[PDB]
Amino acid sequence: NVCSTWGNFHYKTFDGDVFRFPGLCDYNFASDCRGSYKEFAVHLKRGPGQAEAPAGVESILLTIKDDTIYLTRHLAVLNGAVVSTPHYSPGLLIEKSDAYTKVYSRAGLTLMWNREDALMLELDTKFRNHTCGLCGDYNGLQSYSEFLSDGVLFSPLEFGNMQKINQPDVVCEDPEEEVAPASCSEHRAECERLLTAEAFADCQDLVPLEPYLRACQQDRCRCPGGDTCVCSTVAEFSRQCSHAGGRPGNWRTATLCPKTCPGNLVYLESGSPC
Amino acid sequence: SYVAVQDYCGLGSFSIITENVPCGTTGVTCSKAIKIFMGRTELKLEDKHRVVIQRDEGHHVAYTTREVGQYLVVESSTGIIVIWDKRTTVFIKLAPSYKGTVCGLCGNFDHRSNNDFTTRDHMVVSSELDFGNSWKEAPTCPDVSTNPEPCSLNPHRRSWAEKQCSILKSSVFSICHSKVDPKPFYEACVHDSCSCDTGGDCECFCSAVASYAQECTKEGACVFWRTPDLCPIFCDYYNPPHECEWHYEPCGNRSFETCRTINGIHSNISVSYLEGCYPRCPKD
Amino acid sequence: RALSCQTLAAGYYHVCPDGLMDDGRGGCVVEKECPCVHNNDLYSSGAKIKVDCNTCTCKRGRWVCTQAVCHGTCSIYGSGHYITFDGKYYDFDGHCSYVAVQDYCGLGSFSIITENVPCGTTGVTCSKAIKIFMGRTELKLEDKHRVVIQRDEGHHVAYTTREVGQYLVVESSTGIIVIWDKRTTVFIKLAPSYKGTVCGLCGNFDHRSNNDFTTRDHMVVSSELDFGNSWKEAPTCPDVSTNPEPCSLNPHRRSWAEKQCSILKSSVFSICHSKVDPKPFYEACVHDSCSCDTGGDCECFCSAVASYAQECTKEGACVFWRTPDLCPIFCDYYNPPHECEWHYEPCGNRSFETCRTINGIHSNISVSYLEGCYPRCPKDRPIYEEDLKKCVTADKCGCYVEDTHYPPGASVPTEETCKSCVCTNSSQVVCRPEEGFCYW
Amino acid sequence: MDTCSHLEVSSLCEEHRMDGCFCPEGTVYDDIGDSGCVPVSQCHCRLHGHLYTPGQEITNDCEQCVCNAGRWVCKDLPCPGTCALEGGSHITTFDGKTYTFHGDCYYVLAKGDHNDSYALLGELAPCGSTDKQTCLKTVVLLADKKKNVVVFKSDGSVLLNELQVNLPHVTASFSVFRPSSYHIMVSMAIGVRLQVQLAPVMQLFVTLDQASQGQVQGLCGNFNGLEGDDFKTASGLVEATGAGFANTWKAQSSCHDKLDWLDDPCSLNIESANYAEHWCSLLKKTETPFGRCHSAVDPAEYYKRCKYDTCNCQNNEDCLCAALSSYARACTAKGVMLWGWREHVCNKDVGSCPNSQVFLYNLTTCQQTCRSLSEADSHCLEG
Ligand SMILES: *[C@@H]1O[C@H](CO)[C@@H](O[C@@H]2O[C@H](CO)[C@@H](O)[C@H](O)[C@H]2NC(C)=O)[C@H](O)[C@H]1NC(C)=O
Ligand SMILES: *[C@@H]1O[C@H](CO)[C@@H](O[C@@H]2O[C@H](CO)[C@@H](O)[C@H](O)[C@H]2NC(C)=O)[C@H](O)[C@H]1NC(C)=O
Ligand SMILES: *[C@@H]1O[C@H](CO)[C@@H](O)[C@H](O)[C@H]1NC(C)=O
Ligand SMILES: [Ca+2]
Ligand SMILES: [Ca+2]
Ligand SMILES: [Ca+2]
Ligand SMILES: [Ca+2]
């Protein structure tokens, strides 16, 4: 299935289980804990804190069984050498569109990342019962062992803290437990109305709704003022809509997180990149 | 990724693409995978295997994949054939019905060789680098500016390369000297041997010599050039424990009975000149 | 108090009841029937195994072995890797003629020299020829052939040259043996009568390895580059100062070398992991692959892997590691047109009949563990003649006089006077006198 | 020609003769010096440079030699042996033979074979997260006919017979001292000497006299001069790997058996490889303070082990400093003493010394307090 991360430190494992882990140092996004041989490992690196609303990513390290890919905001490095995208090796494909950077591997790994905040990873069914990264395991169980391993119901923050990676030159402090804020249920109507619009007709049966609106709940209250933090969720909802097989309409208006491109190029959803 | 062949030439039915990547440190590049588009089906020859993709629902233009000698052969019922040696060599064979209806790096197959440098926009140019650069697939790919000289950038490897490749001009291939001009193959051997400077340079040389030996066979000169010290081949690996039925056939001139031809299935070309190990199945 | 047949000698300082002790195989057993262990293998009581010249027996959980002195072995291989008679690995990269072994140690009976030359551009050097001085005769192994020089008039110390598997074996009746793979590897074997009376790059063979760095003038040093430099032959040859690091001087070749040489650590050699430590062979493989940067680097790798496969065979693990894409071997080239008799024997464990051993001649070492292609002569002419590599009848093989093969019937050359010789039609060399003065 | 070093050339002469300048019947040509065809009994010896006359003596490491006519004549001198347990798992026997174990049990490091003389144990156990990160946790000594058990834990807190003890503690049979609060030095009248280092990582050094050659068994070998029978089990034959031999010396039957580990930690933790290299490579830099020792002790093995330890363990700086402080002990045993090598790398505690205390490199035992001078001969163990 798909593991995803977006928005204001919003995460989503291979079995749903949407939570919020505002870590900032470095983490093991995904890995292959088969025990015998590690096929792949995806390591995520957050930023120093861009601002209150956004939550970017500095760089991504991705090793597949012999080679490492280091993806930054502006350039991609393969085995210590800068490569002019796209690249067509017989076991690995890297391509750099304007809206995404995509990596395809023959082992059954697909990675898609827009250079600012949104990242998603897809694995085949071969790696079930073996994933051990921050995306939880891939047994298909809904929060079975990710949070309740030995009877103790792990809180999201402590579960995320265990997935850290120790860089032996810098000490980075883990985030402290924040005071439990009020359940931002006063903005539920706004989130439900915005998300369940007309442009999202033919995906109401492909993707659920509860998790993505619960995510909008905190997003709306935790992010006062500009709506740079709520429309980053419905974007993820649309991406999930498009990835399943559906086709959304157009929802971005001139007053609802619009976007601009040079010339008469028209911003759309669900159109062929070719 | 460059267009090897296609008939979407100015609405067409197929296309064959190639994927070149660097192999060495002198800047030269070599083919490492092949992609075949036929109607809607897409085959990919890669990592010593054939992989099917986007197989169409109910058209499935009849194609056939099999392995002959050391080569892998793909044939399409429409009249296209691709022969791949699994490392770098590719032969594309086209029916005569596709005459003067193709474009790409392989020219337009019109029995006229003063117009094969036709760019993507139907201009005839005089520079190799201008005809080549116009058939790239991704616009962001860079443009080639010069042809590097391997033996000049790696002087210390020249002495070896010029010594091993000299077998082409030696008395071993004396029968073939009057039937194939060896100079363009000697130059290819020397050029390749000076460039494989990152590992496994005994595999660049054997293929180079085999390319010329194959033509010598094709014109009617079957020559036996492999020795236990020069590009050895290990055929009896395939035999059952100690029954001897696989044999190295120097020039493939042997026709036996498979379970395809036993039911009337036949090809449309002769591939009876491909090197490799062949069976000699028993009489029971 | 819980003994386990493995803590017997420990002491139990810090389940089964009193008496019986755990055996590690299952239920509790008495001390008398306690088994033995060796190389991660569990042998019951009363078993038998051999160690390179002897035989042992698991008696009471303890091994009892015969006491005979095995031969001594020195190894030279790769781009300057040496193993002395007493088991002390080291490296040395010289460009001159060095004394591999000799008996003129401060009057002597032999000497074995070597010729190291540069191979690569990183400064490393490798052996490419051998010279053997025996009495006055001088053999030279060179260009994949053996050349006799200065053959003495009438002493002609008995030796024997033959070809087993992929290797060339030269034995001497005195007790010296040289095994050469024809590219760079060399094994020198000595009988136990030379103990503590030799000197050279291979140590002095006295079952004591803290004094194998003895220089030419009987001084014990602690540096490889001083021990090596003192055994050069021509005084004008230069002196080595530092050991080159190939993979550091050729960074772009590392990725390949570390990927091909990784097979040693893969599952293919899983059987041999508990019997031979692979690390000192993996290091040599990587070191050799980074250096062969002037051509033919697929040959530096196959020999490196074969050096370890041979030891695995020698210790009792026959492993089949060649494939049509990895160091292929072309054996049936030797067969007649299409009759199939030559077979690739992965670990050489075959004892057939030649026309030497048919007449009672026997060697003194077991070379039944050398890789290569071997004959399987048919049942209508089952005697393997070696000097022509031919399966022939027991009658028409040869004569093998003065280390020179002569076909049956052929008039045998003779360096004597008035003595003509002929190989009979019965594989018998017989000589007659000629009274043309001289008599019988 | 015979040239005063390469004697008996003529016996291997594969050439015929011609004219030229030669030497008389005797008086082999002088090669080491620069004179002419001098007699045989004037050959000057050499030893890494200096030209020694025929009659000048010298004393090498464990032997003394005299320049006879062209060739040295040497005679052995007594010199003891040393076993070392360093890093998490790195054991150097009395005859070299380095190997890596990664065990988990009590083990018999070394014990006199006769029946009772002594015994020295050591706790190797998992130390971090995985099984491949081990440590030494406790040293147990069984002496006085195995009627006295002394325990050293890795927090100080030395204790005798399950009872805390005060230092110094001198007895008739052995003695213990603690000169600098991070080093515990024990001497035994039999001929055994122990050094225990408590920071940054616990380590052990054992030294034995040369009158006990072949009468010791344990993980430290037999100490007989041959380093091929070191893996010779206590039940006959010799083993091949480093873990197979070690398992046979467990002090607790309940422990399991381990196997070798065919991997390099610098390939599993990529983020640490650059750090490990950038610092451990200092050992080969001639301009660096360690460059001085290059003359005496080769640094290659220490460099490789430095990379191994820095990549493997999770306290990378602590392992780096522990590995880097083993080279500066081997070198400080052959004269060359590395002064002021803590200025860039492991100065984390150099400036933390108390009020009047300062970091010293030659802090020997008898630089002690007033009472040490009060006796001045009770506790000045040598060696
Ligand atoms: C060799 O060429 C002939 C000529 O087309 C192929 O025969 C065609 O087969 C397809 C389906 O098998 C039919 O739809 C065509 O009508 C046939 N052509 C003709 C002219 O009748 C034949 O298939 C080719 N060989 C192989 C192995 O496919
Ligand atoms: C194997 O070793 C024996 C032991 O010496 C060799 O036998 C010697 O042979 C020579 C000449 O053939 C005799 O002069 C010696 O007297 C023999 N030795 C003894 C002890 O009698 C035998 O030759 C060796 N094997 C080979 C093939 O040479
Ligand atoms: C393990 O089995 C398969 C993969 O092997 C997976 O689909 C399933 O969910 C897993 N179940 C458990 C209990 O781990
Ligand atoms: Ca789950
Ligand atoms: Ca044309
Ligand atoms: Ca010795
Ligand atoms: Ca020993």
Numbering used by the authors:
A (entry chain B): 35 to 308
B (entry chain D): 883 to 892, 897 to 1170
C (entry chain C): 780 to 793, 801 to 892, 897 to 1226, 1237 to 1240
D (entry chain A): 309 to 691
How does the study describe this entry?
One extracellular protein family that arose through domain replication and gene duplication is the gel-forming mucins, huge glycoproteins that coat and protect the epithelia in the lungs, intestines, and other organs. A remarkable variation on the theme of mucins arose with the evolution of the complex vasculature in the vertebrate lineage. von Willebrand factor (VWF), a glycoprotein responsible for hemostasis, has a similar domain organization and is homologous to mucins in its amino- and carboxyl-terminal regions. Under acidic conditions, the amino termini of mucins and VWF form noncovalent intermolecular interactions that juxtapose VWD3 assemblies from different CTCK-linked dimers. We present residue-resolution structures of VWF and MUC2 amino-terminal segment tubules, enabling comparison between them and an analysis of the features that stabilize each one.
We subsequently discovered using dynamic light scattering (DLS) that a dimeric MUC2 amino-terminal fragment spanning the D1D2D3 region but lacking CysD1 could also self-assemble, but only at a lower pH. Remarkably, in TEM samples prepared at pH 5.4, the D1D2D3 fragment exhibited tubules that resembled the VWF tubules found in WPBs, both with diameters of ∼25 nm. The VWF and MUC2 tubules also both display twofold symmetry perpendicular to the helix axis. They differ, however, in that the VWF tubule is a one-start helix, whereas the MUC2 tubule is a two-start helix. The MUC2 tubule has a helical twist of ∼83.2° (about 4.3 subunits per turn) and an axial rise of ∼6.95 nm per subunit. The MUC2 subregion map also consisted of two adjacent beads at a nominal resolution of 3.4 Å, but one bead appeared at higher resolution than the second. The resolution difference between the beads in the MUC2 map may indicate greater flexibility between beads compared to the VWF tubule. The recombinant MUC2 D1D2D3 segment used for tubule assembly in this study was intact. Nevertheless, the MUC2 E2-TIL′ junction was also unresolved, suggesting that it is a flexible joint. In contrast, apposing MUC2 D2 domains appear only very weakly associated in the tubule (Right). Additionally, interactions are not evident in the MUC2 tubule between the bridge and D1 or D2.
